[PDB]
Design a protein around this ligand. Structure first.
Ligand SMILES: [K+]
Ligand code: NA
Ligand code: NA
Ligand code: NA
Ligand code: NA
Ligand code: NA
Ligand code: NA
Ligand code: NA
Ligand code: NA
Ligand code: NA
Ligand code: NA
Ligand code: NA
Ligand code: NA
Ligand code: NA
Lengths: 553, 557, 554, 58
């Protein structure tokens, strides 16, 4: 006895067909399609193939001089011809990923109100309190399997962008489709608008959100609770909810509460941890060594930092068979007050305590790098230019091949650049970054730095959950995904300095990740699509959305 | 690859409002649209000011329905309602099942098929003809409900006792599916009535200016087989492996061949063969609970040895096999059949159609039913011959002379073709016969008692059996599911029915009867490994009840 | 244009959307090519049946329903499922079907409307829509409205106050505009204004569809009507025809008075009935000799409808003789509930009865008035059945050779007398006509076929005349012109059977002539806006007429 | 009234501010042809905004 929306169904014809992104083929409508659907005359005589349409659009797209104009033309395409959008992205993913994802999506979010054109996603605000379920009914695709949701509090390293954070889930789900093969009709981008503490946006006449400060405490928790309950009631038990770009306290609390009642994943805490782990398994495959033999130092000890560290420690426990507390002993984190150490146990946030070992207090990253002498440095602070020449030279002075992960996004917030990491280390850093850098020529050799970004993981991980009918996420699924990504890494990639295969392999990578995730769901008793298929890799491959145009009756 | 290239329908959706909402029978509530729904969907002024509950709409509709003078007028008004307010139709039907069943199923539905062209109003169901050869799948694509789970299909060749009515047989699957919804709780949106038009041999219909089908004699042999094969392969491709295909009112030889060809490859069921077997078995099981005895201890005599009749026999034998652990060849030996030529016996084997041979036991030839009844001395006598009044006074008296409580089933429909009347069975046995029939008879008063004879209607079985297949994800029908349905139906027969002589519970309990049958069928499907909705829920009765469609209006704001 | 608007989407109809749309649905007449191009294959059975065979099929089942009301029900259901089929069936079987979709069966339908309510028809505007009438009009999905027929249900035929169940009347009236007058049904809007009802039986009926209150009156009533009339002008413009039906007599007059100056309006009961009666009298005198001025007229019922008929007779006498209108009233008498309207009562009459208050001894009963005045014409508007008694008709037949008797009250059960009674009690000599239909009467070897003096002969052509000439006001001379056009169609073929009007089988030809004469008169008076006038108005009217023959669809 | 809640973000922008917003991005296109493409796109997305923008910035 929920209220229901009454939907009418009809055959799309004429301009109705041309104006529906899900069906519009533009000039690719065939002769017969045109004569059966009243398109004759509404289009010019010539029939153009999907492949020529891609070429035409790529031609005009490269004439836009700024990355933001290219993001704009891509989103406009997504909202006019969805299959072309996805075939174009897939076939040009290496070139286009920086424009629809990091870094450009970050700029899109900062300027979202000033470029806002065709509506994308669903906005749920404080003003919908008591009527969330009401709002969800307005979404015209009934069969939702993947939700990506943000409150915009922590967009990349750019801070609080409020209701303009919508570009992040819209981005993420396009990658679920393009990289992961998830059907776009079952994807739902959501922004929850509870206000913003961003003064500049509160005073901007184009800000698209509620002009108030962020709600906190009960007012916030009640809205989230109503949302999560509405999702369960409307979409069932198997809907994947992916949390994106919440602040530390909220992100942890949400994962703690809803991972017992729903199928949830936090991309920053769990996705990032998984991709970094894979990058470490591959880095050790190129330069030798075990995960247990390393000493880890993190700059930044919130969601991503502590989550990556926990996953690394967890995999150390699996490979050594030692208790988890032992496996944390060579993982150290530095926050804004400095090294996290026993003498501060007095007053650390809960998620940092397990990392506080007995050690002298140290104020700065540089002093901690000097005293701890890590084999591995991982930056997630969200603060640019924080891996200095002095730091990379130190890391290069006491390791032959220092592993440097500069994970903060977008590009301007990167801890260092690939250029700086290879030069300041004399060609010896194993380097990966959150955001893309071009190849670096150093002293006559080419380095191709891998992008340690959770886009390698979430698309296949989510596909794995969906094809298996998983109802909960378990940490062993994260380790299974990390291992499936590292296992795709080859000698070809390593010779170029790349810890990951390139994104031209992404569909195949996603199919192996999904297969390993699904297998793990079956093994733990968390899968509801029983029985398992006979070949999970083949099944994942066969499940994947293809954006080649349909023929229409 | 090649099936990815197949053209699809570009369906679009939009919010229904105004007359688009009022003209869609799936959503239309008429005067039951609340003030709030009217204000939110642009209905204000299109309806008068008053809001009428679903219960008052039912009462309103019943009052006018009862003022129509002929059964067929009532059929027409009921079909019109189905096609304008679907939830009102289903709720009206459920709450008045005993009174309305004769207007919307048997016998009125037969009369509607006879006259279907002359009363054709609002379209119902999907017609597939010989002219759609090579493009059957393109026709299925025109049906605007995408997830079909139950199909009831006919070629119209043998509609009740009325013969070949060609394309005008659509009244049958339309009626059956209404019962699947009302009695079984199958959601009407997942039900698809289909008529396959391959011509008709009914000369009257071929000359009737109002006949709605192809104006030609039936296709036979290869042309027919190929169209059917294209239909069955298109059904599988478009709706998947789990769709139920119920065959209805095919000619006899055809009905068996389709069932044997397609039981290997699809989920299929024929109501006239499998359903009837199961309801008769349920009846024997209830009768024996009423008078004592086991199925194994009986001796059974059938008048009529049609292929459909031998399937009743075979199911009785199979159940005797389960209760006894004896091979089925041993259990057939107390089941006898009489033909036009007399008792089916071993010495006739050479001149017997093959389906009769399993029943051809060692015995002296007997030319007549009466001689067979006196020689064999059955405890149970079952009529499927299609000839009225073959259970004579001499027969009923013989049956009553060597049985305390003779069990007598006159299954031939309609009433004029009944082997005997209820009045006769009870009068000629001095009140002692356990009686049931295919056609409805009024109660009988005899000396002291009042007798309400049970009616061998396979609507007692098909709705819960299909529900059971659907809720388990069953992929094949197995004969043990038919046994499980029969036992579940007989277990619902209370002492209240037995006091009045009724071996079946009344249709007022049908929704609960369906859920028990569905549970027993589902449980069998899990047991035989034929279920795909895994794992099974722990309480299948409860689960079956909660899967049942309820036609209470939805709220729209 | 701070005026909100309803955004309407437009698309090509197919599949079920086509089948369930009564305006486009052809049922089994969709052709092979239409089916293949509109996703209908399989949704319909293989055969293609013509429009004519659909009509035959439907008439066959129709004639098996045992009650008139069941036939009305089947016909409304057909109007709401296949419009073109409905209108063609009705036009080709008009004599047979009229008594089932119009008087008398429509009366019973209104009395039982809640109990038989199926497919929605028309637009309901209630007191609860106050302040929001325009918003309700926006919900009607046909934008170009040219003819509104509106009631408040207060005086439905002679049946009284039926409240919101009065809807049946405008709905039936508009069907006749289309079937009989050729107005396109898409441009017709039936409306019921629900302000409550004084019928206690309906207020206590669980199936009553209206507001469960007594009728609003005074300023409250007038405010709703004003908002309504202002909304119709703003939304449909200056040229929309508003036909008022079945208002109480006081409201009927006041609304005609007030809105005649501001809108194109027509009251069917006061003007339509006046015009069909005049035409009947013009025919009747062509058949038995004499002049309108030399008759003596007696009315039973002095409502603003009886006085309306009387006023138009006096007006045409004025035109024919040149005498002032006042003197043309001297031989026109009316009997109300307290008796004959006479000068000695004048001080205490309602003002509208005063022009008829001639000097005469006061008389209490109709019969006394019939014996004292000795009319040549007796016209009944009472709403009370069987008031033209044997004694009255015998009297009329003793001092007139051919007494003219019009028994106008509907439905049949409220008719002043029956045709059997008229011809029997007059010995075959009455020229009789009635509001409701009667079967042929056999008397001493002669067959009498009584005419129907019902405004269905007039309103269809008259509104078509207003519409095609772009008229902006109704003038009394249009009513005289319509009367004369109808009487000019009466021939000796129909007089020989005793019918003062041509049969309904000629109604399209009659309506074209009425429309031509109404339009000519609009141009002649400076009331027409479709300029310049076409030169052959009768031909133009015929060519303007809706045909319900199916369209072919691409 | 028209089932838009959630499909749009919370803020309501006036016709005038939409004009200003579109003019600001229009000026940042480098070529005349790009300005044409953006205008044609607006004519086919929001007809009234297109014509009002054009009339006020003719
Ligand atoms: K970041
Ligand atoms: Na979270
Ligand atoms: Na397509
Ligand atoms: Na039926
Ligand atoms: Na057959
Ligand atoms: Na069969
Ligand atoms: Na029987
Ligand atoms: Na059942
Ligand atoms: Na149909
Ligand atoms: Na109505
Ligand atoms: Na009358
Ligand atoms: Na949106
Ligand atoms: Na809001
Ligand atoms: Na415009």
């Amino acid at each position: 006895e929920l209220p229901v929306m009454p939907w009418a169904t009809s055959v799309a014809s004429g301009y109705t067909l041309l104006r529906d992104p899900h069906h519009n083929k533009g000039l690719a409508f065939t002769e017969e399609e045109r004569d059966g659907h009243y398109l004759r005359g509404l289009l010019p005589p010539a029939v153009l193939s999907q492949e020529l349409q891609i070429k035409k659009f790529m031609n005009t797209l490269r004439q836009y001089q700024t990355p933001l104009q290219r993001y704009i033309a891509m989103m406009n395409l997504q909202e006019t011809d969805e299959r072309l959008f996805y075939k174009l992205l897939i076939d040009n993913v290496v070139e286009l990923l920086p424009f629809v994802y990091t870094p450009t999506v970050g700029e899109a979010c900062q300027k979202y109100g000033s470029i806002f054109g065709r509506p994308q996603g669903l906005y749920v605000s404080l003003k919908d309190k008591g009527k969330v379920l009401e709002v969800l009914r307005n979404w015209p695709h009934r069969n939702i399997q993947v939700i990506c949701v943000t409150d915009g509090e922590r967009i990349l390293g750019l801070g609080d962008l409020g209701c303009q954070g919508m570009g992040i889930p819209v981005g993420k789900l396009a990658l679920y489709t393009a990289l992961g093969g998830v059907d776009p009709s079952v994807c739902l981008p959501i922004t929850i608008d509870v206000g913003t503490n961003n003064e500049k946006l509160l005073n901007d006449e184009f800000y698209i959100g509620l002009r108030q400060k962020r709600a906190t405490g009960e007012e916030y928790d009640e809205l989230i609770e109503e949302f999560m309950s509405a999702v369960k009631q409307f979409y069932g038990e198997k809907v994947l909810i992916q949390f994106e770009d919440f602040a530390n306290h909220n992100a942890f609390d949400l994962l703690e509460k809803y991972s017992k009642s729903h199928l949830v994943f936090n991309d920053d805490i769990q996705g990032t941890a998984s991709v970094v782990l894979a990058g470490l398994l591959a880095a050790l495959k190129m330069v030798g060594g075990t995960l247990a033999e390393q000493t880890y130092l993190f700059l930044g000890a919130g969601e991503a930092g502590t989550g990556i560290a926990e996953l690394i420690a967890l995999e150390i426990s699996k490979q050594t068979n030692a208790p988890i507390e032992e496996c944390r002993k060579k993982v150290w984190l530095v926050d804004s007050k400095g090294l996290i150490v026993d003498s501060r146990k007095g007053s650390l946030q809960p998620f940092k305590k397990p990392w506080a070992h007995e050690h002298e207090p140290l104020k700065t990253l540089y002093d901690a790098v000097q005293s701890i002498k890590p084999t591995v440095l991982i930056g997630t602070s969200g603060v640019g230019r924080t891996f200095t020449k002095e730091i990379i030279e130190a890391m290069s002075s006491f390791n032959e091949r220092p592993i440097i992960f500069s994970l903060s996004n977008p590009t301007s917030h990167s801890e260092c650049t690939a250029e700086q990491a290879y030069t300041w280390s004399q060609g010896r850093s194993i380097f990966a970054s959150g955001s893309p850098f071009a190849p670096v020529e150093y002293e006559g050799k080419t380095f191709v730095p891998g992008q340690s970004n959770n886009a390698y993981i979430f698309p296949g991980l989510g596909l794995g959950l969906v094809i298996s009918g998983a109802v909960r996420v378990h940490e062993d699924m994260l380790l299974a995904a990390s291992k499936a990504l590292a296992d795709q890494a080859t000698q070809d990639n390593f010779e170029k300095g790349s810890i990951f295969p390139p994104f031209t392999s992404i569909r195949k990578i996603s199919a192996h990740i999904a297969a390993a995730v699904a297998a793990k769901a079956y093994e733990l008793g968390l899968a509801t699509r029983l029985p398992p298929p006979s070949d999970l890799v083949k099944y994942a491959e066969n499940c994947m959305y293809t954006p080649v145009y349909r023929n229409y009756r």
